[PDB]
Symmetry: D4
């Protein structure tokens, strides 16, 4: 009779986290499980080949400052891209605040 | 001579399921294979780090009420996000009905 | 309490047309109102600058063979792109058939 | 120094409306300004060539049941697509409810 | 011989503006030409039916706090959606800063 | 000085195959490696939970007629969705022909 | 019986142009009709508020070097964004060449 | 109080590489980890079934010329698609240059 469309829920409607929970507090690398959540990865990309170093984070602003490192295919050492600070400072999740 | 475009079929043209088939009826967790179908996951996201608890379901309306749980990277325990009811109530698949 | 997502309906769930209704049967140009439906136009594109000539059409297969013409910005004459037949032969709408 | 991405706000974060405000209560046609909000129109589509008849609406469920009509290019009369009820029954906007 | 793909340039690679240039400084409404740049509008949406009131703006942070108003189809008066502050506070454009 | 955008190549610019190469000619199931190419799968979907039965194929038209089967999470048996023929008949790849 | 998907043709399958045809050779501004083709404009953006100056073009490489100018909402004068050369150098259309 | 949208960072804002680092200099195949970065793969595609041969590369222009090879499902031999040169010549990453 009538078409009643369904829905697939956006992940950001179900999941949020304080920025301090995103990274290992002693190594300062984002936990592997959250790298695809912070970075829009190309389809099929092998996440074992990258890591995100947390250079800064703000509890007040719920922001992270990160630097990407990637695995050199020859040596298998993680190397930085291309200085001293973060490549990007961003607010990972939607907030409802002042 | 002439360009004749091809097509890639949308999964929702081939697959549908009654909502009672989406979850384990004794544990009340959505089966692992259907979590990406219900939730739009970011590219490369590790589904082993989440699970969906079915809080409610309606056979009449073909809806599910779910709560997301995620694996704490330190303890490896599944923890709820941020109460008592579902985070979302939705109709997973297109329906043709009253 | 619970998030209940809404929906915006895809135009193709509401609209379909026999291919003979898509074009002026005497001029053999697709009606202006259907050009954006047949061709995925870039956002903001001025449709007055193009037209689609129907070179072939199939009632049995519900296909159209078209050639695009565009308005030369200097002369304001419609000119073909870059032979004798259609640039593309395609089935504009979803069908449920043999 | 650091890249700080900006954002473009999704319209659905700013706009919502009770379903009774979506249509003319005497003619039962969705107001012209809301047709692109309810239907995902192809880029550049001429909205003057369509209208949405409200066949049903639910205040309790915040749903609308609509039928699309389109302008015949020859006669300029609005004609239905392809019965007696709505083509689709849907919830236009996100809701937070029971 | 070889396929050499072309490109369409993203608008954000060519255009940026200080936030004070986005709105009329005496009326505090975003200029009409920038409303589609700040808000992701559905395809074909009639922008004459909305306006964005600037409730706050930050020169230091390059952010705007806005409230959406829409035209009531009956009275043709602009009315707010659904309090006293902005509905959203966001950074419209990418920044490279501290 | 000047921004020179790069490009990521669409898979369909590099890959095409005759339809007879898409499936095992004795079992009549599409080869596992091509299931994501024929069906637009949701991000993260476990392809081990589905298979595509080739019900028909046309060398002349370069089309396939398929039926989807999915793994029942309890029994681990592949079961059809919801008759006797294909669920869909489509042309997987772009063609340049008569 | 079987679902047979339709198609909407991508504009780039039908339209291509030598780069010298994209702009007025005496004013060196891209013709208005091609601005949305070269730049990915946000939905609903008023193209009367921008123009593209051609700073360089290459017949051999089929590239254009452009600078965007926008209309100041107060004075109604076209002003450049934020030097002496192009903001971007790109190849507008797909090519098959050496 | 106010909605403050978050962001997910595009991979191309964090990662770039000289084209000589994209492939094994002795075998002339793109490293496995970069195949999804160069080619837009369908969701869920098994990258073990393809490889990219570098036929040409330009240090001056930061371009690569590649040919795709895929694994024949029967023999498990890598075979070329459908001559002697690259299928595509492209610039993988955004550049800021002359
Ligand atoms: Cl925190
Ligand atoms: Cl059920
Ligand atoms: Cl017909
Ligand atoms: Cl209401
Ligand atoms: Cl400012
Ligand atoms: Cl074949
Ligand atoms: Cl030229
Ligand atoms: Cl290099
Ligand atoms: Na994926
Ligand atoms: Na549009």
């Amino acid at each position: 009779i009538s078409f009643k469309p369904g829905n697939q829920i956006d992940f950001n409607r179900l999941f949020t986290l304080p920025v301090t929970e995103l990274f290992d507090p002693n190594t300062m690398f984002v936990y592997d499980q959250y790298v695809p959540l912070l970075v829009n990865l190309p389809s099929g990309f092998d996440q074992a080949s990258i890591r995100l170093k947390v250079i800064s984070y703000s509890v007040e602003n719920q922001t992270l400052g990160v630097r990407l490192e990637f695995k050199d295919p020859q040596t298998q050492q993680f190397i930085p891209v291309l200085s001293t600070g973060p490549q990007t400072v961003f607010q990972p999740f939607n907030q409802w605040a002042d």
